[PDB]
């Protein structure tokens, strides 16, 4: 069971809860801290003193003073009037991540919510009650979270088979009585970054796995075209250019290609080249390349930079998950804190950066595909990997286009964290648009799986056409077999879409990262 | 019935076929021209002479010479190997538009396809057989069109209830025998801009209707806040700044607000202001605004610029629809033309421009919403249009956010027509990415309907709160009633998402443009 | 003196050398290590062994083997043939930063360059000989660096009074005999990321000062409008939301406003509002805002996020500065390393992230200007800060425009790190475009100084119009005085451009940061 204590939750744990449906538990210690905060807070609210969103109107209308006799109505009107999300609904796993993020925030203890709220959110996750959350509305996450809050009071909708179903009916069925929103509970539930933080957690965790699966297919490809191992030597990174991500990619590449009979060492290349040179010629041509193109040599640098970005984002998300992103906040023995911890700028920035890094990861993958399909670059392989008669057959020629087109499409996705537009009578004059940033990243992530899908298919085909399977390392043979388990070698031309979608789906669920886990003793970073 | 002659097809007709399921007919004259082209062409191919994609490999592999004995296989292998589209499938109406565009292209007579191909495409449209076309793959439209071509030879998939169904089964059922691809027919079916041109036609036609529905709600709003009519006077446009689009918007605005008892003439404003001024004061304050903010005065200029862009795009699309966007091409008494009329640059540019214009249309609408919800700008209306007790109730405060957020999101959509990436061994070193451009435009179009939805709801609410219904013009009363038919006045706060989605859907099907048609004698440009 | 040892150079140290003309010194240990590497390397090159760029052609032409007898010409043709930079020339400080970065790289000892190369570079820096480097041409930094290398062999141009003068006469004009490039020296001088890393260091270092100067005027503004101190309370950050940047900004804000008689504590605002509410009624209006708008409240969250991005970039840059970003590389007892440490992806990403972070910093600054100029938003200030009769005078109304316009302009700047385009026969099939990223960030940084200048002038004017000078904290008074030393109070309308440029220049110089350090006991993070 995952412990939601608002203190030690990790991105990986969030994914277990969201994707693996792992059980959630709010420890007794967190419940005690919440109960104490609530009790003291109630005493303050009971005195009818000014507290944002508790005894005042919302946003710009904070100038309106509301009596404590309107407690439940104030909180209820907020949730209803703000459930104005539009567009597609988040998938079940995305919605679960968002709920889990909100639960952890409140579990931290500074939101002054009744323990029952924590218990109910925990119950929805544990019993599989998934809110229907529209993806659009947050300025960075009122709208999305208001739809979640609605399901707690028996309103709004819950997701069932990808379809929204009236919450009232679902609760009546599952035998659950809706809650009533007391002081600050409506606001606490919707005043945070849980939308972008929950979705961002899924994206970043998956992005790291995508970085690994890119390294996996890259290694197979390098072996297929017999590239040099020189670029991955530890000295060039650990010593010469110690960027953390760069060090990790190189280490993974070395581990992945360990045991290969196809890769060539620099010592062997220069020797083969020295013999091919004759001695009375000052300048002479050679068909031997002492070094390969950037797409097969600058992998540690590029994928490493992507990793560095992903590491930074995961770090920010971990901090955010275990933060009290709510307002106002309760701190014992202190005035009620009135700030802006609901502002998602830190995460909006983080996700816009992930979008950029992942776009480049796809740019690299796409150029690697170009490399093996172009006879002028493939190094001995037939044009477009045609096994039979080229021309009559196009092989993988048409399969390159969707990959190329996706690189262009990802490049049309611009940063959202800088696109703030003032609203609410200028009260919200600077916002983060962080959920848009997170959805942009999810999109590139999804597009990259299609790009990698074509690369995995091209790599396996290259192995088949060159008859180099027996020369592959243990990891490469495993990668090759994983692909071939889904899609057969390309003999004569054939409809490609189903083949590409099948491998794309495998990538999305981390099947190749699994193959290596299961088939080799390799532990990827 | 719509006449598909490759000569006079209009964007409106395309939409009738796609959306209204209007019958298609290829006139006898077009059939005769096709039959003649095919017969002469066959005689040429029969001689086994070099003809791109007929007796040669494809793209970069044009260096491969293929004997006429491989006729059917060559064309078949192309269609199969290039059916590599990925992502979501186009909706039924979008797919129909694409098919219709391809049919019109071939109907022009320079593609040298057998009349049967025209007849079959026409049959699929007339019998409701809709190809399952993945949205991603085109570099600008091989992949998408290859999936369409597949359905003609009993391969690929057809769309049924939003689900892809094996074409073979559908044809066996409907009692139809798949065709065989003869010389050049596989290539002719997929070598064009029909994907971006077909989808672009739907978008542009709808965009013009969106421009009209923006003018409709703008007029209602202007009447509700009693704005000045001065900005719309014909002299300021027809004479002073004759941009075509600007002239049309002003004319529509004048027609829409004709008969209003709420709008004020400049003569009345200056007089009311002159009386409010006293005479011994050189500088004095007044609560009277002789002119209103840009969002209620610069409508002809902004919406007019949007119209100009839409007019240009529709013109380009009309030309493209009735062009032979295929290669190579047959011209009697001439060598076979080997060019690049498959290159979608003209349309890629057009659609990127539509994306930009529509984004601004939404920017304007969103600021008009801000105008009526902000008590400092609304001109007498209650804050956020709250009918009861503000603070306790937020009214439309939360509904503004999805509109604001969509403006930011549309701004994250960048031009695709400039993002060419070389592929196919550098043979396709400069592409247009036009289908991405068209899908970008469709997205902004769709987002704008949600923005306008909030504006229509805010406008009607403003009419209710100010009690100005009886002062509304005939068109305004009609617009108001149209909205109220779907959604009730906002008394106490309530869940808003369903209300917003309902009006957004009405906008997408042109319900407000219809209300004016049906209820007034106004004929909008 | 600044020690360029390839191990401990900092971003600050780079700026001292570049901006303050600080003397550079390559430690004897570095020279010794270089010497050692050079001796061993020379022994290998003498064997006519295959080494990239030493005994082979460059880039794609690596298939060409070049005999050691062509030692000097090979290196020379390279530098000449690649000196193809275009566009404007870098400023003297920028050029110096680039040279310093390259020198530090070679000082690491793995480039196998003769010590004289290190010495001559250090001499150029110490003697004020600045290379004329055009800004465009790097794919991420061959062209920029080739222009630098040219000056070492008496070719290309040197920068004098902003104009390029032939290096030949400049060297003669000061008794320096040009050098002759030997094995690997030409390549080592131009094969790295020193262009983007040198410029990036300057930008990031100045960006941190900009964040501080943003916090400085923001604090002044908050005091001028009597804002609440609640948002900056440590507990809200150090405890509730532990983001490093957020914690730093909050700490800085508390220190900047310490001792203010104008700011209000939450407790006082709360009591003040309590006193204003009547009993009985459960909903009543008030003119008191318990909380201020976001632009005055989520400073820690927004600027903190900017800071986190800047800290990450500085970290990347420090690592890069002290790395062997060159190829091939020498490691004693190992084969010559043939990798891609010249690939600027880590820096390209970092600078693209800085561009985004700084854009939002300006967004916030501009909305703060809007707050103070708008009578409906500013607390106790006349419209547009007009001292006399408004209407007759516009005050700062016209000055808001350039700030607003710059936010829009910065938003048109897109990421460059993802815009790779393949070149050099596809050898450079995946590049970083990092120098473009670095120049993008520089542009936003520069634009922000103008936006901020308007904010500084507006803040000072607000102090004068409200007569709140005596209530200002020590830091606020110092800021006010610094502004007033440059520009006087705005009485009647006047030409504004010179005043704005004056304050903008002061900002670029870090004058306001210096005012706080020279007049107060504050130490800003
Ligand atoms: O990135 C190249 C390398 O060192 O591998 C660089 O030296 C280079 C210089 C000049 C060229 F024309 C191509 C590459």
UniProtKB/Swiss-Prot annotation, chains A, B, C:
EC number(s) on file: 5.4.3.6, 4.3.1.23
Q: Which residues form a coiled coil?
A: none
Q: Quote the annotated effect of residue 60 to A.
A: Despite a decrease in activity, it shows lyase activity over time and still produced some amount of beta-tyrosine
Which cysteines are cross-linked by disulfides?
none
- What does the UniProt keyword field contain? Antibiotic biosynthesis, Isomerase, Lyase
Result when mutating residue 401 to V: Complete loss of activity
Q: What does this protein do?
A: Catalyzes the MIO-dependent deamination of L-tyrosine generating the corresponding alpha,beta-unsaturated acid, (S)-beta-tyrosine.
- Residues holding substrate: 82, 191, 297
User: Keyword Isomerase, does the record have it?
Assistant: yes
Task: Kindly provide the PTM information from the record.
Answer: Contains an active site 4-methylidene-imidazol-5-one (MIO), which is formed autocatalytically by cyclization and dehydration of residues Ala-Ser-Gly.
Annotated consequence of substituting residue 52 to F: Complete loss of activity. It does not affect the over-all structure of the enzyme
Annotated active site: 52 (proton donor/acceptor)
Cite the SUPFAM superfamilies for this sequence.
L-aspartase-like (SSF48557)
Q: Write out the catalysed reaction.
A: L-tyrosine = 3-amino-3-(4-hydroxyphenyl)propanoate; L-tyrosine = (E)-4-coumarate + NH4(+)
What is the recorded name of this protein?
Answer: MIO-dependent tyrosine 2,3-aminomutase
> Tell me, how does this one assemble?
Homotetramer; dimer of dimers.
Query: Is the keyword Lyase assigned to this protein?
Result: yes
